[PDB]
Amino acid sequence: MLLNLDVRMQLKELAQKEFKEPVSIKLFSQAIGCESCQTAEELLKETVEVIGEAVGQDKIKLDIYSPFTHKEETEKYGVDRVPTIVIEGDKDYGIRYIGLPAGLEFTTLINGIFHVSQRKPQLSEKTLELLQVVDIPIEIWVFVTTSCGYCPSAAVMAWDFALANDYITSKVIDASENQDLAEQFQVVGVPKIVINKGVAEFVGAQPENAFLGYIMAVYEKLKREKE
Amino acid sequence: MLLNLDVRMQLKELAQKEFKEPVSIKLFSQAIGCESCQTAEELLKETVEVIGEAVGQDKIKLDIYSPFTHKEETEKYGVDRVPTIVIEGDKDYGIRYIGLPAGLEFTTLINGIFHVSQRKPQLSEKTLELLQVVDIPIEIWVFVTTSCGYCPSAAVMAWDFALANDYITSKVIDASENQDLAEQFQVVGVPKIVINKGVAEFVGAQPENAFLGYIMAVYEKLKREKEQ
Amino acid sequence: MLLNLDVRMQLKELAQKEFKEPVSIKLFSQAIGCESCQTAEELLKETVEVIGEAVGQDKIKLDIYSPFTHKEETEKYGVDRVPTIVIEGDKDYGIRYIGLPAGLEFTTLINGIFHVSQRKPQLSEKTLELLQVVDIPIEIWVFVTTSCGYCPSAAVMAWDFALANDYITSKVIDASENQDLAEQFQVVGVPKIVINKGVAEFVGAQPENAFLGYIMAVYEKLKREKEQ
Amino acid sequence: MLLNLDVRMQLKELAQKEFKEPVSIKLFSQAIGCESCQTAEELLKETVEVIGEAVGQDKIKLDIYSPFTHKEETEKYGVDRVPTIVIEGDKDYGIRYIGLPAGLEFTTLINGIFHVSQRKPQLSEKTLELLQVVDIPIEIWVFVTTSCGYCPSAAVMAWDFALANDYITSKVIDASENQDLAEQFQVVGVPKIVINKGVAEFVGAQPENAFLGYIMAVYEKLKREKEQ
């Protein structure tokens, strides 16, 4: 298929070995008049199908929404561009993927699914103790490419932070499919992390504590401004 | 087909609720050198077929012209790029789509058809009364991409202004298919609105009143210069 | 086949009525890795086949060169980008087409072939008398699109000036296939005429005398700074 | 075949006269969402096959990697975009092509393979002597288009500088396939050279010495800064 046997084999293997709680995946796309635009649907369908036949079709569902036919569901999840993927559980953690999760970013999609399934972020207690003080909306953007070997670790880490805090939204953005944003935030080297559209910016997959530092720096500044 | 079942059903439902007066659509396309022209022809054929099925085939027509075999028709509508789409009623309101209205821009196409059908712009009386003073050619360009959720509202609003005044022409332009123009007007974030090739420019789907403001500022400047 | 039966018949009679002296056509292209880049070759081959059928397949020939295999030939003519088309008689008049002459530009290609064949420019005697004093290299570029109805006139006119003077080179450039040049010289409305890469610039299909005025202005400035 | 007989015979002939030491080519491709990747694979397979036929299948090889299947290889070569082409000998000189080396850029690809085979930069002794002082990472980017005749010269020169110094990396970037980057570095005219992402920039195929100047001016600025 779109995913050769070799890949489908180790995926179900990881699924039964890593999957825990139910996962809900929603794709918002409008491929009208564009072929390639519907590759995201096929890739997602195949991955959820493989995971399902490994842990149970009742533990992971994929819903594809066209904003033309489902305008309300689109506004509910705050989608403003397509394709936008939502990975969630019983609740929405603000985890998003803007683009096609192919290539090495397939690793990103898979881990995100398992982390949401495990309902636990891969973050230390010390990080979580300080992170809990953040109570002002924080938006983390992680610009990636499907070929950069270092992007997955930064993308998943950003998802972990959003998974751990109700005020944090993390979006992994494929630069090639979002050139307007890539140019606006001067994305050259990747991964490039942008927080609250510019308050903080850094490049490279940083250590957990360094990442926390940039987040706190944004919260610290947003707090002051809040008089 | 380009439009699947649920889309056609949605489209049919909308047409029955919103269509009114007759609408005439004109597509300028070329056989060679135009990668998206063939996709545009098919997209428009299906769209017109579906709406006509829901409101009456005779109420909406599509004419496809190749510039080579229709030089005069091409000049009449001021076409200099393909694909170019004209949506008009009995009169030409200066409404144009330059590029392929795929993805989220399909919504733009659909709404443009219905606003023209209703022969009424979704603009307030406040806006329409002032817009009456505009009597010097104003050209509005809205640069968009097919994946941006904010472009449709900006695109349709530009079309409404064109629909409301005979001196206003509004063109929704796909930035990806028209990179040369986008680069010359520093298009980065979309939608980006450009009035009279630079006299006024702004980004984002701004409020109706703000839009009117930029338009009035341009008109005032043109008026001054016209009086010298 | 790009040229259907109807077009071929019209071309044949036009050729019988307009063709005179022999014409040589050179196409420089390198479509390696781009199948959409082979259209110029096919279009020219058919065009030349059809004209040859009407006036003698020895009165007009088409040579296609790849810079990879014919670097010297490419250099002989000042070819610096592909696709580049040369239309000449027994002598090279500096007439060039940069891009794919499709759509309405097909008529530019055809008329160009006929004017060169007749070895005579469609310029008034008054024009030719003054133009003859030009003895410093002048380069005229005409930016066009394949759907603009007014471009053919400006394009052929520029070619006539090149045909009429050994110091004048005229290149019709397709904006869409040469965006780097279209952006650099701010091509928005077409046709846009650029003389000597910026010394003079104007838009629209201008009257013979006005075109001449721009050429003279450029000649004058060039002469001045040559002796200055 | 993407390479017609004419091109293949020319390439075989050139290989016989210019190939020397073994060359290794690595292509980073993606099966999904990358249009040009497929054409790249075919283009390189044919090129390597033709060259192997002329000088021996053992003297040149091609490895194709999918980032997903070979994460380490990808990081080892600093690949972050596809298609990306690596041309090396026994070692990696930091020579890269980002995009499809089609059109005139096919010539760039070929000459790159030959210069690397010869383990010899087409640079003067003077230039090679001074370059020995460069010992701070220098990155050269050459933005090109497949239709520009001046790009091959600039692109190959940048690769020669990378070939000559272990601190210099040179990437030839197709501007059409990497518009985000081209827009960020104000690429209009081509070729456009950008050193160390902005420390120095210039356009056009400059003479060897001018090229060296920019590189030295950068090295010097970085040296002073490193000395503080």
Domain positions in chain A are 2-116, 117-225
Question: Would an 8 Å CB–CB cutoff place B14 in contact with chain A?
Answer: no
The sign of the torsion formed by the CA atoms of A92, A93, A96, A102 equals: negative
Phi, psi of B96 (to 5 degrees): -140, 150
Around Cβ B210, how many Cβ atoms within 10 Å? 11
Which two structure tokens, joined as six digits, stand for C222?
């060039």
Around Cβ B55, how many Cβ atoms within 10 Å? 19
Quote the CA–CA distance of C180 and D192 in Å, as a whole number.
Answer: 11
Which residues on chain A are in Cβ contact (under 8 Å) with D82? 103, 146-147
The partner residues of D169 in beta bridges, in order of sequence, read D139
**Strand duo A192-195 + A200-203: pairing:** antiparallel
Quote the CA–CA distance of B43 and B49 in Å, as a whole number.
Answer: 10
Which two structure tokens, joined as six digits, stand for B198?
């630079």
Q: Which residue on chain A is closest to D84 by alpha carbon?
A: A147
Q: Which residue on chain D is closest to C65 by alpha carbon?
A: D6
What do you get for the CA distance between the two ends of chain A, in Å? 56
Question: Would an 8 Å CB–CB cutoff place C102 in contact with chain B?
Answer: yes
Say if the Cβ atoms of D184 and A189 lie within 8 Å. Answer: no
Burial class (CB in 10 A: 0-12, 13-18, 19+), D47: buried
Say if the Cβ atoms of C179 and B180 lie within 8 Å. Answer: yes
Around Cβ A110, how many Cβ atoms within 10 Å? 19
Question: Would an 8 Å CB–CB cutoff place D188 in contact with chain B?
Answer: yes
Q: What is the 3-state secondary structure (H, E, C) of chain B?
A: CCCCHHHHHHHHHHHHHHCCCCEEEEEECCCCCCCCHHHHHHHHHHHHHHHHHHHCHHHEEEEEECCCCCHHHHHHCCCCCCCEEEEECCCCCCEEEECCCCCCHHHHHHHHHHHHHCCCCCCCHHHHHHHCCCCCCEEEEEEECCCECCHHHHHHHHHHHHHHCCCEEEEEEECHHHHHHHHHCCCCCCCEEEEHHHCEEEECCCCHHHHHHHHHHHHHHHHHHHHC
Is residue D134 within 8 A of residue D168, CB to CB? The reply is: yes
Q: What is the 3-state secondary structure (H, E, C) of C75-123?
A: HHCCCCECCEEEEECCCCCCEEEECCCCCCHHHHHHHHHHHHHCCCCCC
- Measured CA distances, A147 to A45, A114, D65, D79, D82 (Å): 22, 22, 11, 7, 7
Is residue D174 within 8 A of residue D105, CB to CB? The reply is: yes
What do you get for the CA distance between the two ends of chain C, in Å? 56
Say if the Cβ atoms of B150 and A80 lie within 8 Å. Answer: yes
Listed residue (C117, C110, C109) closest to C93, CA to CA: C117
Question: Would an 8 Å CB–CB cutoff place D80 in contact with chain A?
Answer: yes
Whose tokens are 């360094």? That residue is A210
Which residues on chain C are in Cβ contact (under 8 Å) with B73? none
Is residue D134 within 8 A of residue D166, CB to CB? The reply is: no
Whose tokens are 């005069």? That residue is B72
Quote the CA–CA distance of C6 and B66 in Å, as a whole number.
Answer: 15
The partner residues of A81 in beta bridges, in order of sequence, read B148
Burial class (CB in 10 A: 0-12, 13-18, 19+), C89: middle
Quote the CA–CA distance of B122 and C214 in Å, as a whole number.
Answer: 47
**Strand duo B168-174 + B138-144: pairing:** parallel
Chain B with chain C: Cβ pairs closer than 8 A: 67
Rounded to the nearest 10°, the torsion over CA C111, C113, C116, C118 is -70
Quote the CA–CA distance of D126 and D121 in Å, as a whole number.
Answer: 12
Which two structure tokens, joined as six digits, stand for A64?
């594809």
Question: Would an 8 Å CB–CB cutoff place A100 in contact with chain D?
Answer: yes
DSSP structure class, residue C40: H
What do you get for the CA distance between the two ends of chain D, in Å? 56
Quote the CA–CA distance of A127 and A178 in Å, as a whole number.
Answer: 31
Is residue B193 within 8 A of residue B150, CB to CB? The reply is: no
Best C7, C146, C147, C151 member to test B by mutation, with max B CBs in 10 Å, is C147
Question: Would an 8 Å CB–CB cutoff place D57 in contact with chain A?
Answer: no
Which residues on chain B are in Cβ contact (under 8 Å) with C100? 32-33
Quote the CA–CA distance of C45 and A101 in Å, as a whole number.
Answer: 45
Listed residue (C201, C200, C224, C209) closest to C129, CA to CA: C209
Which residues on chain C are in Cβ contact (under 8 Å) with D103? 30-34, 37, 82
Around Cβ B201, how many Cβ atoms within 10 Å? 16
Say if the Cβ atoms of D188 and B183 lie within 8 Å. Answer: yes
Buried b (16+ CB within 10 A) or exposed e, B175-192: bbbbbbbbbbbebbebbb
Question: Would an 8 Å CB–CB cutoff place D184 in contact with chain B?
Answer: no
Quote the CA–CA distance of A158 and A87 in Å, as a whole number.
Answer: 13
Listed residue (C164, C162, C158) closest to C208, CA to CA: C158
Quote the CA–CA distance of A193 and A205 in Å, as a whole number.
Answer: 9
Quote the CA–CA distance of D143 and D193 in Å, as a whole number.
Answer: 6
Listed residue (C189, C184, C211) closest to C200, CA to CA: C211
Q: Which residue on chain A is closest to B187 by alpha carbon?
A: A180
Which two structure tokens, joined as six digits, stand for B149?
């959720």
Which residues on chain A are in Cβ contact (under 8 Å) with D79? 147-148
Phi, psi of D140 (to 5 degrees): -110, 130
> Edge-to-edge strands of the sheet including C168-174?
C60-65, C23-28, C84-88, C95-98, C168-174, C138-144, C192-195, C200-203
Which two structure tokens, joined as six digits, stand for D195?
């050193």
Say if the Cβ atoms of D104 and C79 lie within 8 Å. Answer: no
SS3 C205: coil
Around Cβ D228, how many Cβ atoms within 10 Å? 4
Indicate the resolution in Å.
2.3
Question: Would an 8 Å CB–CB cutoff place B76 in contact with chain C?
Answer: no
Say if the Cβ atoms of C33 and D150 lie within 8 Å. Answer: no
> Edge-to-edge strands of the sheet including B200-203?
B60-65, B23-28, B84-88, B95-98, B168-174, B138-144, B192-195, B200-203
Is residue C41 within 8 A of residue C29, CB to CB? The reply is: yes
Listed residue (D66, D73, D87, D111) closest to D169, CA to CA: D87
Question: Would an 8 Å CB–CB cutoff place C81 in contact with chain D?
Answer: yes
Question: Would an 8 Å CB–CB cutoff place C171 in contact with chain D?
Answer: no
Q: What chains are in contact with C, requiring at least 3 Cβ pairs below 8 Å?
A: B, D
Q: How was this structure determined?
A: X-ray
SS3 A210: helix
Q: Which one-letter amino acid corresponds to residue A208?
A: E
Q: Which residue on chain D is closest to A186 by alpha carbon?
A: D184
Question: Would an 8 Å CB–CB cutoff place D190 in contact with chain C?
Answer: yes
**Strand duo C168-174 + A168-174: pairing:** unpaired
Question: Would an 8 Å CB–CB cutoff place C188 in contact with chain B?
Answer: yes
In CATH, the number for domain B2-116 is 3.40.30.10
Could you please report the per-residue DSSP string of C154-197? HHHHHHHHHHH-TTEEEEEEEGGG-HHHHHHTT--SSSEEEEGG
Which two structure tokens, joined as six digits, stand for B44?
């428009």
Question: Would an 8 Å CB–CB cutoff place D76 in contact with chain A?
Answer: no
DSSP structure class, residue C67: T
Residues 6+ apart with CB under 8 A from D31: D37, D66
- Asked if the bond preceding A207 is cis, omega within 30° of 0, the reply is no
Listed residue (C106, C111, C112) closest to C88, CA to CA: C112
Angle B106-B108-B109 (CA atoms, 0-180°, nearest 5)? 65
Could you say which of A33, A180, A184 has the minimum Cβ distance to residue B102? A33
Angle B198-B203-B206 (CA atoms, 0-180°, nearest 5)? 115
SS3 A34: coil
Is residue B34 within 8 A of residue B69, CB to CB? The reply is: no
A61 sits in which H/E element:
strand A60-65
Question: Would an 8 Å CB–CB cutoff place D79 in contact with chain A?
Answer: yes
- Measured CA distances, B180 to B3, B79, B133, C120, D146 (Å): 30, 17, 34, 36, 17
Burial class (CB in 10 A: 0-12, 13-18, 19+), C207: exposed
SS3 A120: coil
SS3 C64: strand
Best D147, D176, D190 member to test C by mutation, with max C CBs in 10 Å, is D147
Chain B with chain D: Cβ pairs closer than 8 A: 4
Q: Which residue on chain D is closest to B175 by alpha carbon?
A: D179
Say if the Cβ atoms of A32 and B102 lie within 8 Å. Answer: yes
Angle D110-D113-D119 (CA atoms, 0-180°, nearest 5)? 140
Q: Where are the alpha helices (DSSP H) in A56-201?
A: 71-76, 105-118, 125-131, 151-164, 179-184
Which two structure tokens, joined as six digits, stand for C21?
């002296």
Listed residue (A72, A98, A71, A75) closest to A87, CA to CA: A98
> From the CA of B134, how many Å to the nearest CA of chain A?
33
Say if the Cβ atoms of A147 and D184 lie within 8 Å. Answer: no
Diameter of chain B by CA atoms?
58
DSSP structure class, residue C63: E
Residues 6+ apart with CB under 8 A from D49: none
Question: Would an 8 Å CB–CB cutoff place D30 in contact with chain A?
Answer: yes
Q: Which one-letter amino acid corresponds to residue A123?
A: L
Question: Would an 8 Å CB–CB cutoff place C104 in contact with chain B?
Answer: yes
Do A and C have ≥3 inter-chain CB pairs under 8 A?
no
Question: Would an 8 Å CB–CB cutoff place C39 in contact with chain B?
Answer: yes
The sign of the torsion formed by the CA atoms of C167, C169, C170, C175 equals: negative
Is residue A215 within 8 A of residue A154, CB to CB? The reply is: no
Residues 6+ apart with CB under 8 A from D156: D108, D111, D112, D115, D122
The sign of the torsion formed by the CA atoms of D197, D203, D206, D209 equals: negative
Say if the Cβ atoms of A149 and D184 lie within 8 Å. Answer: no
Which residues on chain D are in Cβ contact (under 8 Å) with C69? 6-7, 10
Whose tokens are 């133009």? That residue is C131
Which two structure tokens, joined as six digits, stand for B201?
């420019």
Is residue C41 within 8 A of residue C50, CB to CB? The reply is: no
CATH architecture of B117-225: 3-Layer(aba) Sandwich (3.40)
Angle C30-C32-C35 (CA atoms, 0-180°, nearest 5)? 100
Which residues on chain A are in Cβ contact (under 8 Å) with D72? 149
Which two structure tokens, joined as six digits, stand for A79?
């989608």
Could you please report the per-residue DSSP string of chain D? --S-HHHHHHHHHHHHHH--S-EEEEEE--SSS-HHHHHHHHHHHHHHHHHHHHH-TTSEEEEEE-TTTTHHHHHHTT--SSSEEEEESSS---EEEES---TTHHHHHHHHHHHHHTT--S--HHHHHHGGG--S-EEEEEEE-TTBSSHHHHHHHHHHHHHH-TTEEEEEEETTTTHHHHHHTT--SSSEEEEGGGTEEEES---HHHHHHHHHHHHHHHHHHHT-
Which two structure tokens, joined as six digits, stand for D85?
């082409």
Which two structure tokens, joined as six digits, stand for B226?
């016209």
Listed residue (C95, C142, C97, C137) closest to C115, CA to CA: C95
Which two structure tokens, joined as six digits, stand for C143?
């930016």
C-alpha atoms less than 13 angstroms from C-alpha of C201 in its C-beta half-sphere: 13
Question: Would an 8 Å CB–CB cutoff place D36 in contact with chain A?
Answer: no
